[PDB]
Amino acid sequence: EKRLREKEEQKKLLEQRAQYVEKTKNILMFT
Amino acid sequence: IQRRLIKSMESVMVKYDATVRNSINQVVQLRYGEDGLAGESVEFQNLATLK
Amino acid sequence: AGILFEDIFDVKDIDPEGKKFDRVSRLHCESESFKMDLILDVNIQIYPVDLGDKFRLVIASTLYEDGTLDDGEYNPTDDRPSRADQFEYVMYGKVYRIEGDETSTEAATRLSAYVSYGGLLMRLQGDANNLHGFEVDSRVYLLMKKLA
Amino acid sequence: DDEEETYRLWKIRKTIMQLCHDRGYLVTQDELDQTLEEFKAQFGDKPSEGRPRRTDLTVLVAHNDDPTDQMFVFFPEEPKVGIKTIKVYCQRMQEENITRALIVVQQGMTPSAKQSLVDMAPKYILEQFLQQELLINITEHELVPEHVVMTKEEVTELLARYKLRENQLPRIQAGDPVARYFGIKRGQVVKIIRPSETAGRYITYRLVQ
Amino acid sequence: QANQKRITTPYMTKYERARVLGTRALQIAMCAPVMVELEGETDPLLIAMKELKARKIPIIIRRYLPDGSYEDWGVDELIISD
Amino acid sequence: EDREVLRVIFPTGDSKVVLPCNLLRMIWNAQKIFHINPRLPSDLHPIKVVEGVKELSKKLVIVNGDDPLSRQAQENATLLFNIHLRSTLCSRRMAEEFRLS
Amino acid sequence: DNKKKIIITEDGEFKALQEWILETDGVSLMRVLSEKDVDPVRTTSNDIVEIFTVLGIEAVRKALERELYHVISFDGSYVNYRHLALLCDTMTCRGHLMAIT
Known part of the structure; x- marks a missing residue:
């Protein structure tokens, strides 16, 4: 169960990566 | 100081739903003393599993 | 009989810590027949006790020579044969503690019965074989007599 | 520098x-x-x-x-x-x-x-x-208890349980340091959980203003 | 308010006891019928306390709640401590 | 678990608390009322101690209600007392310390 | 021990660490907290107004309870905590510091 929860942590981490790769272009055209 | 304290807290009362409220009916404490117990019956004791 | 304990004690010390009360004195005594230590508070004003004295101590559950319980009430107009007639100093108290060297698994080899005679305290400690008659919150008598 | x-x-x-x-x-x-x-x-x-x-x-x-x-x-x-x-x-x-x-x-x-x-x-x-x-981070201070922003369903449940109006709860200013930390606006209720020496735990609820 | 579910304490408060005893003692003093038997009592307070111990005081306590509702408890329905 | 809850409630090691019922005095009262012999084995089942303490805890109600919010407020209102009660009326203490029947 | 650092050893005992502490004659809690090697968790003040401005209404509630308790108990006296709690709730139930004036 702890392994599943850490895997959910990893999937959330890659989800934040998958949205950060969108957010960097907005930060780029910001300045 | 005594008069000031009294006039500040005079109407705070334990209600029949056991909440402590003032005259405006605003809630000051959801239970008296956070435990809903009167101060005459409580007494000093020791928690045996703390130390 | 109604006797919980009987032995002859020898006063080995009086007030090691110093005289605490004027009319009361603490005796630290030891017997010979059972090897039991005794701390006893006695009214030395009416029954003086000197160092090195030797006395017979009898802890009893009752004063009546026949097995008969007591009511704990003062009856001076009692004509029954009482064993207090055979002793000089008699007190009446209650057992308020029984200590021992018992462990969680082993029983007690040595016991220590504590008695209070209206505030005059006694501790009789020694082998647990000699202190089976003692039970806490139980009334007893002292029945102590000096001998030469 | x-x-x-x-x-x-x-x-x-x-x-x-x-x-x-x-x-x-x-x-x-x-x-x-x-x-x-x-x-x-x-x-x-x-x-x-x-x-x-x-x-x-x-x-x-x-x-x-x-x-x-x-x-x-x-x-x-x-x-x-x-x-x-x-x-x-x-x-x-x-x-x-x-x-x-x-x-x-x-x-x-x-x-x-x-x-x-x-x-x-x-x-x-x-x-x-x-x-x-x-x-x-002021929320790590020993004086600051645990604040929890309640949801509208939770607030409705609270007011229905204790049978009271929002103006009867104790208040917290919208400009409060912890209210600003949690970014809560007027109308929201914050549940404060603090330890109590008489009860062990105590939950109070403050309405944002 | 649903009388089937009364949320207030099942105990009579010290203030409820005080006021109920005073009220019933005044009622007895004003020649109200007594609900319990009487040996020789002539003081209304003693009669009221005897009625409370017997749980035979014909009074209903209307406890108001902060929301405005109320709960009606018979003096025989409450737990008398003192 | 109660020990850790107390450790976070009282970050300084002060076990002096103010609570309703003096449980040690009540235990002493029970010992003297029923003439408990501390030297003899007891006839109290430790499972009876556990079950009785749990039912007692259920009967001590400061906040009334079956709803989850009332349940949590009830838990909080009597938390410290219930910890004191579970640590005082423990099965082991009731077996080798108090030796109640 | 009220100002020492009370920790829980690995064995589970309460241990009072004897550590250096600073007492200032003025108050800048806002600045002192944000200093290197300064504990931002236990560093406090006796000026309740600054506690309210820096930490908030519940922080000043707790601090005000602490300061009133310090004033009451310094002469060895003792007051039931529910009275201090009721006074402190009266002064803080409306989101601001309500003086008794």
């Missing part, structure tokens, strides 16, 4: 990440506990010359419940932030379609800028923070 500047930037970023995590925004554990040396590696250790510039410190997080509910954290360069800078940030938020932001100012913010932050609230909920008050 410079090592302390990057230390302050790292501390501010740490408090901001903790703040976003407590508001419920998606924050990875790695950036949640980022060592000062890791911060220097990722941003630099010479902010004075321009590595890192505060514009590189900008954060953009997404809410756990809604990926579209994102939030910005801007770090203006000027000590006293002016209305023009607020307009620039609002323009950027419009372009990127983001509706919430934090502005971590250094010295302060002009009255016109604050009035701009207040008037356009229904469009963009953008807050103002001093870098001085982000150098510490």
